[PDB]
Design a protein around this ligand. Sequence first.
Ligand SMILES: Nc1ncnc2c1ncn2[C@@H]1O[C@H](CSCC[C@H](N)C(=O)O)[C@@H](O)[C@H]1O
Ligand code: SF4
Ligand SMILES: [C-]#N
Ligand SMILES: [Cl-]
Ligand SMILES: [Cl-]
Ligand SMILES: [Fe+2]
Length: 356
Amino acid sequence: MWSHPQFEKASTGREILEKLERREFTREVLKEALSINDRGFNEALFKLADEIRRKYVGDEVHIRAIIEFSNVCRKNCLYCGLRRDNKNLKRYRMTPEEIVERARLAVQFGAKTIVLQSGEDPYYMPDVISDIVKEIKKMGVAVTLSLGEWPREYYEKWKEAGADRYLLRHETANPVLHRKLRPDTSFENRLNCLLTLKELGYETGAGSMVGLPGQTIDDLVDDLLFLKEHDFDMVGIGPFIPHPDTPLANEKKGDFTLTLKMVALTRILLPDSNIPATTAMGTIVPGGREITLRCGANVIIPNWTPSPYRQLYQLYPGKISVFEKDTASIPSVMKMIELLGRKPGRDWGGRKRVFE
Ligand SMILES: Nc1ncnc2c1ncn2[C@@H]1O[C@H](CSCC[C@H](N)C(=O)O)[C@@H](O)[C@H]1O
Ligand code: SF4
Ligand SMILES: [C-]#N
Ligand SMILES: [Cl-]
Ligand SMILES: [Cl-]
Ligand SMILES: [Fe+2]
């Protein structure tokens, strides 16, 4: 019987980069790009993604100020510190006046988008959110909501109240793992929400965690292909960070390099999308968001949740630095952007269609 030797690894890695540069995004090519463990291949992939980012989204790093206004959640996701079964966390809700005034302060510090994010907290839904959104829209900025899965009628009310964008990370495109990790719901529910949000005219954001328990490289390829299929306006990617007060406490943490390759491939697949350097990337490696901004990301989301709430929004350990004042994050990220040679966004930074 005759032999079947593999190709040399250097020549394989060079061929994969060429396929990516020519935009031949077959499953095998995406799988091999995520499986190669070579510093020189990875650096060339990050440079390709940085090139694409320069050409189709430019040098602005858009600043979105987030206010995490309630840590109450009716769901029980196995990865999240806010899951309802975690009784070892003090819960909070901000008043609408606190939220609106905190948003006004971020606008005065120069944020051109306000992100409102919460647990799935029924107290607010739908009418308290609508009132808050109407007040923030009078400040002349964009509004992004990130409130979870709700009925079409609620999404429609919030669009009429003026909301521009909605971030609903898809978490994992594998439906069997999705149901195991999110026992209240399903990938079909999550996708139907994203489809409803797009049909209503929101700019929509999806995106997965990298390194979840049970997730394989083939699953990460399916996440990339799902993102490509829908041409999402925004994509939020970060590593899974185990939380000690959850069932996943003892599982492996998501790997930084693999997550950065996911960000880089997402930029290559979706050249004009908005891609944050997420909080979780800054949690796992010192300077992690700065690195990610050189590997295809073009958005940063400074934490604008005020004390004493901000330290209770404990999605994962290490998320909040207790050492600086709760107005430090917007000037800090502006300094970071300056030192990278980039500039803050000039307008609201909505996704544009310039590729093709
Ligand atoms: N342990 C963990 N590690 C990393 N990211 C996590 C995490 N737990 C939650 N997250 C991320 O935090 C995001 C926001 S949770 C708040 C918004 C809303 N309840 C929703 O679920 O969409 C989730 O989309 C998820 O990707
Ligand atoms: S990920 Fe969102 S829905 Fe799930 S428990 Fe956390 S806050 Fe609730
Ligand atoms: C999220 N950053
Ligand atoms: Cl946004
Ligand atoms: Cl921050
Ligand atoms: Fe985020």
